[PDB]
Design a binder for this molecule. Sequence first.
Ligand code: NA
Ligand code: NA
Ligand code: NA
Lengths: 356, 356
Amino acid sequence: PCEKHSCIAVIDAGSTGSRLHIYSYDTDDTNTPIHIEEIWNKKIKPGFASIQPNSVTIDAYLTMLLADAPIHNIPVYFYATAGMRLLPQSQQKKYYDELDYWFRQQSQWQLVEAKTITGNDEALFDWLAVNYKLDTLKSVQNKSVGVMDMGGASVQIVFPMPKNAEISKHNQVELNIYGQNINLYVHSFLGLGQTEMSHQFLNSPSCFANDYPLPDGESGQGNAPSCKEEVTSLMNSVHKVNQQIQPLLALNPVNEWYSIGGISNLASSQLFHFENSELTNQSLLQQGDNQICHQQWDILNGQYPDDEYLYQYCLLSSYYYALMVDGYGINPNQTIHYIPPEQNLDWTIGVVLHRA
Amino acid sequence: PCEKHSCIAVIDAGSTGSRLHIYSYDTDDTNTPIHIEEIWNKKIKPGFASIQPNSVTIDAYLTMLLADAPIHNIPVYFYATAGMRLLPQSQQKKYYDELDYWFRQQSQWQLVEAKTITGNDEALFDWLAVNYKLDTLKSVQNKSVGVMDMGGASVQIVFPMPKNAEISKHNQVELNIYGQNINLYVHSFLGLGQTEMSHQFLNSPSCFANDYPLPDGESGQGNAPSCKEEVTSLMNSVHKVNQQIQPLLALNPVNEWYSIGGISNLASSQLFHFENSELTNQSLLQQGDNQICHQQWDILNGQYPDDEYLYQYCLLSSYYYALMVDGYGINPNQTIHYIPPEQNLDWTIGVVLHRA
Ligand code: NA
Ligand code: NA
Ligand code: NA
């Protein structure tokens, strides 16, 4: 396949593991990739930031990730995300030093770049990946498409916005895709991903089902509106999500919202019911409140003993609402599309489009 | 030594590693331990909550921790703290199931209890340990002693307070030590430990030295008062530290404050100068502001290339001030004693006093 087409490997070194994607593609007369096809996909655990940065450990890890790969001599991008951003730069440097050394010795993998990408770059790739799959990149669009990525340690938001001298250059991207100039606003909130966020609310009774045992000895007494208010304080009083994002969405309205990441998992669980891979925040909060927050934990756990994430669904439904409604200012009745978890839609497609 | 005296093993399964303490002690006629002496101390890495909960991994870990121990057949308490509290109960259960099995097979270690203790219990042990070392437990005291424990994932505060029907039973302890009844208020804030807290402020320029590279591409521009205000929002708007603690300290004044944990490390570094193992918050903030926040990172890093924690000292000095002054309501001019890091003062002494 890499015989008659171009090929690229992109490694997503994420929070819970690393995923190797190998893509074939052709290039059109705008110097933009087309016919992007994933020819190989392998995931290993644990996350890169959770292993020791030495030559023995890195070799085992990278050998495991790449060894069976049926396609050999191709350029590689190794991109780590928020899990690595949480580590001191001096600690990150150890990983990248070892990784450069490992790839040098491999005559079959040509390492182009290995780095911890910013949340802003991640947001750019998120937007490219979704829009590529919706087939909205090829021609100048009537409608504005926004993407929200709901990650473990960070969340990203990205939408079209003309160049603005009053906004940090770090929050703005310019790119040309299929011959058209695009200007995007990008933002990442490090610490507001669901795992990192959750560590501030583990002892909040309003955020767990009735009688759920909290770490410090109290009991769950769930109430989604109360939990949502607690989470909103982290969003707005600490991160100032509302102050930063709402003015920009007011002035640069989004016609269609697409969400990727954790929300797709929650919405696709047996506890929530949504049609057409779409939800509204109003519905999400109401369902979380009724089906989890105000249930008895023992009864709930007995009906669904196989979902290890169930216990968190009161907090998560409250958190998504706090983020989208209280943070981003999205109307509770606004349709939000979520990309089905089973779908071969991954942010690494954006790396192909932008960097291949 | 366990020949003529009682002995107990206490394992502190903490965030960055586990520390085995073996103590000899005698018992006085109030049924209280006396002459508590540490006869063995071993620490291993990493933290218990960071390893896989299976029989092979647990065996290697526990064998490593206990194998060389020169003293054999004695009761063991295995107590995990905030690192384990961050994990789902279902995940914690796997560890404790494996740990029970491992200890059953060892005829030389009699496992009494293995559990994740609450922050409230941790706070109790903190207070007992400090007061044992200050020799203030043996007789009825004129003065009120308070303890603050500044941990990686949680912080604890503990001080005398009579039984109060208006306060959760979980935040109050009754105990009898050296024949005297004691009543303590205990509180733990999970998520407010320095590591967990820091994950919300990694992109805050006010919290890092000038030109320090932040993960999302901006540059440090340190200012301790501004950083302190950011951290205070997490303390008070999210955790409500001020609302919960300040009324209680007003009504139950503390005459002497002792702090353990991270503050001792910061204060004992080459960048800060304090006498008599005492600081004031005013001085801590001023020193952090002048010696780190408003320094050029390149110059600072060049003078102290061996302190891997240096880059965080603007944030940490700001955070301790936010916690003690804006959270707990302590006057910026109030003397705070910190226990020297080199000192053999550990919270596990409290387990001996309370449980042996
Ligand atoms: Na190579
Ligand atoms: Na045993
Ligand atoms: Na965290």
